[PDB]
Each structure stands twice: as C-alpha cells, then as structure tokens.
Design an enzyme around this catalytic site. Sequence first.
Site, short mmCIF file in Angstrom:
data_model
loop_
_atom_site.label_atom_id
_atom_site.label_comp_id
_atom_site.label_asym_id
_atom_site.label_seq_id
_atom_site.Cartn_x
_atom_site.Cartn_y
_atom_site.Cartn_z
N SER A 1 6.33 -10.38 1.82
CA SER A 1 7.66 -10.30 1.78
C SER A 1 8.22 -11.92 1.34
CB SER A 1 8.15 -9.98 2.97
OG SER A 1 8.75 -10.33 4.14
N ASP B 1 -3.66 6.57 5.91
CA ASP B 1 -4.25 5.90 6.61
C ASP B 1 -3.71 4.69 4.91
OD1 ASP B 1 -4.17 2.87 7.22
OD2 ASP B 1 -6.79 4.28 8.32
#
Length: 330
Positions: free
Chosen positions: A199, A35
């Site tokens: 992004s 994770d």
Amino acid sequence: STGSATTTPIDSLDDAYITPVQIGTPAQTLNLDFDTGSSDLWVFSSETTASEVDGQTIYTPSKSTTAKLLSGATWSISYGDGSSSSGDVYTDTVSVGGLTVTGQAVESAKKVSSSFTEDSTIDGLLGLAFSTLNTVSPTQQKTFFDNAKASLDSPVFTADLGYHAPGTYNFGFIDTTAYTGSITYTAVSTKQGFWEWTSTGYAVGSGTFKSTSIDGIADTGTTLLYLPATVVSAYWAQVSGAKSSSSVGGYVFPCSATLPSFTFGVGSARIVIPGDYIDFGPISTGSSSCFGGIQSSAGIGINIFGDVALKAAFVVFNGATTPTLGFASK
C-alpha cells in the site's frame, strides 16, 4: 468456464464469511470460509473426532462415488489466530458457483481445535493463497483456483465482500457492474506464498494522506485490519477514550463513539473504509467498551489487509503468470 457464488457473513459483526461448496457425487454442500491467506481446502468430515463436531455439516467420503483416498497423504495446519486442524486426504469433485474441478484434494479433518468446534457455521476452509503453502505431505496439493485456472475464461478470481450483507466470489471473469470507477492494479510478491502487496499510504478521517509504503497481505480469512503500530496509534488517537488494552488484547473504544473513516492507498488510488466498518461491538455482552477493527500487527510479523479493508473494495486476485492485485471502489 466461470463460477459465481454468494458469500454470507456468519454473524452480525462480519466475523467471517461462508460460501456454499459442492463436494462429491451426489453433491454434499458445505459452507466454507474462503481464505486468501491459506492454501488448504479442508472440511469437517465423518472422520472428525466426534466430540470436536458441534453443529457443522460434515463431508462423508464413503457416500461419494467420486471420492478416492489419496494414499499416504496427511495434512496439518496452524493459523495466525492459534487455531489448527489436521487429517487425511481424498480427491473428489468440487464445484463453486457452477465451476467444477475434478480431482481436487479435499482434506478431511480428523482433529480440529476448539475455535473450529465452537463455530457451528463454518464447515471448513477453502484456501486461495498460493499452492506453495499447501500443507499436504508427502505430495503437496494444489488449491481449487490453481486447479481451475487453465479452464477459466480469465485466470482471476474476485472478492466482493459485503458490510453486514452478502457479497460474491467470482471465478474466471471480472463483473464490471460490481464496482465504480476503474480498477487499480498493484504488484504482488509470491515469495511468502501470500497475495502480498505494498500500500502507498493512509489517511485518518478527513486528515491529510500520509505517503508511506505498507507491505501486507490481502487475506479474506482474517477479520480485521492489522497495520503497523504507528498507523494504528494515529487512527485511535482520533477517537475520544480509545486505548490499547492488554487485558482485552487490542484497541478498545467507547461504544458511544462515532468512528472516523480510514483510507488506504493502492498506487495513486484510494480506498475508503467507513468508520462503521471498524466497529466490532462490545467486548463482552452488555459492555460499553467496544472492540476496534483496526489493530496493531506488531506481534504478527506481517501486516494483514483483512475483511475490514477488503469489504470496502472490489478486489481482483489476478493469477496470470505474473500475479497482481486489483482494487476498485464500489
């Protein structure tokens, strides 16, 4: 040193991925959920409340000659999906794919919430975010990667998750045969303890690319792609019959649909998520309403590039003094 381990979807939807991890001496192998959005290595154990264990493999520290109680240390964690777990702490030897760390904090669960009990395939979590998020008190503990870093050939790990197929976690090296083209690296902020990056935009299907900054985290422990409501609405508007359902808890769409792809920007590069990756199947057995793999982050407080996004790429978690993320197509 290096390590290399195969990671395998737990079910036919790729809801999560499990990776075998050797703990203790002699080895006890547990299948952990790696994770990158948390920083605790915790396991179902011989100390876990018996009614809360339902098929998982347990770590038994009393059977490990290298286990040592970390005196006074406790841990307690809550995840974005509302699940939680807590317990005490041992140090022991932990190996992943041939890479060994001695003295790793292994957090032994005394209690786990229902969703963990109900998932017999996940024996615990191995956190790979930054150690500043580790919950051990009163002495915070380091992640497996942080402990291994200095010994690694290169201070990196990579995630290569498969679509409906196994993939690979590598530590200490970049497998240049595992991706196409080049790797585009992008800046990371560690201020929230995550692999947080920005992004450069998105496209829906064959549509034009929209240049817009989207801050979010690379999180292998989250199944879906959670993005701003404007982006998610633009995606699902291209699917006839798709709608946001408050009763189901997100966007659903007709199971008869063919989904468009979704592209996200990494600098000047582009990662394309095929439409099929966004199908999470019937909302309940036999339903013709299917659950979408792109969902709004509006109720989270952060955008999350979960498995839906990451499994479309070869992803480099670069833990150099100034960390960065790399993405390549594959």
